[PDB]
């Protein structure tokens, strides 16, 4: 909520991705904290397994509800940190409700 | 420009992709958002930091706000705690 | 300090170009035999694989830690 992005670049979301989709490289932000300089999910490579949702300790990467993101060009499907963070901000209200409903189960 | 500062110079090729298009960058840049977060004052020497909400937060860690000299910062939230 | 990954011999092909990709900055490689590392139990068998497949080989002898004598009593010696 405060506004600090949840990901702390542990990079095991990259480790467990079956398709090699997520590419993460990180460096200590000036704050001294640990953040990802580049987080790129290749959605065409991704097979939407949902393990990344599973693996994240801070649960920074989540499987969002939207399924309608068909794109005219192949490049648009490749997603960098800014698109995903923007995707996160747009759907945060529903993502929070969805995680709220299913966390007891997990 | 962006959180990291990725930017293309004038001589830089690879900047054409934006020609007649838009780039993805972020307002609400996080780098400054926790800096905007007040320092959580505490009574105890050590304090926890579930991230807020337990299971819906970060793996709990206990921070040693033992020196006023430094406000402990949970490595996960970047929240400074003022002894 | 675990030594379970220093047991079996491995033969690894020489490393090749890894240029940056212009669109996303991902590493890109043109060498197919790069990520391939075959594991062979003994030096003799690995040498055989190189000869019949025709790849050049340069075997490196295993170097195992030398026996080191240790005894808790020895360091308690004020003398030395």
């Amino acid at each position: 909520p405060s506004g600090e992005e949840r990901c702390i670049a542990c990079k095991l979301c990259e480790a467990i991705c079956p398709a090699q989709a997520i590419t993460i490289e990180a460096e200590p932000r000036a704050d001294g904290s640990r953040r990802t300089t580049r987080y790129d999910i290749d959605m065409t490579k991704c097979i939407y397994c949902g393990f990344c949702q599973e693996a994240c300790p801070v649960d920074a990467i989540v499987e969002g509800p939207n399924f309608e993101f068909s794109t005219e060009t192949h490049e648009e499907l490749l997603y960098n940190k800014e698109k995903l963070l923007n995707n996160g901000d747009k759907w945060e209200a529903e993502i929070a409700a969805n995680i709220q409903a299913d966390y007891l189960y997990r | 420009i962006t959180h990291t500062g990725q930017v293309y110079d004038e001589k830089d090729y690879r900047r054409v992709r934006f020609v007649d298009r838009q780039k993805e960058v972020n307002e609400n840049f996080a780098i400054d958002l926790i800096a905007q977060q007040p320092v959580n004052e505490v009574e105890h020497r050590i304090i926890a930091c579930d991230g807020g909400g337990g299971a819906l937060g970060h793996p709990k860690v206990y921070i040693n706000l033992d020196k006023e000299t430094k406000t402990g910062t949970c490595g996960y939230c970047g929240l400074q705690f003022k002894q | 300090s675990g030594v379970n990954n220093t047991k079996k011999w491995k033969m690894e092909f020489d490393t090749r170009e890894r240029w940056e990709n212009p669109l996303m900055g991902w590493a890109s490689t043109a060498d197919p035999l790069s990520n391939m590392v075959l594991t062979f139990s003994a030096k003799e068998d690995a040498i055989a694989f190189a000869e019949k497949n025709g790849w050049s080989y340069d075997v490196e002898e295993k170097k195992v830690p030398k026996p080191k004598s240790k005894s808790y009593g020895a360091n308690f010696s004020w003398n030395k």
């Binding site: 490289e25 300089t37 580049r38 790129d40 005219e72 060009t73 490049e75 648009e76 490749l78 997603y79 960098n80 940190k81 800014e82 698109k83 | 962006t2 959180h3 990291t4 500062g5 990725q6 690879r14 992709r17 934006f18 298009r21 838009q22 780039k23 993805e24 | 940056e20 669109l23 996303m24 900055g25």
Partner: peptide, 24 residues
């Protein structure tokens, strides 16, 4: 309840000795 462009966000990785602009 009541067009993106993908790019590498990481910066350069190997810098380059810039010629001395002082002629010799």
């Amino acid at each position: 309840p009541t067009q993106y462009v993908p790019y590498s966000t990481t910066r350069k990785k190997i810098h380059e000795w810039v010629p001395p602009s002082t002629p010799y």
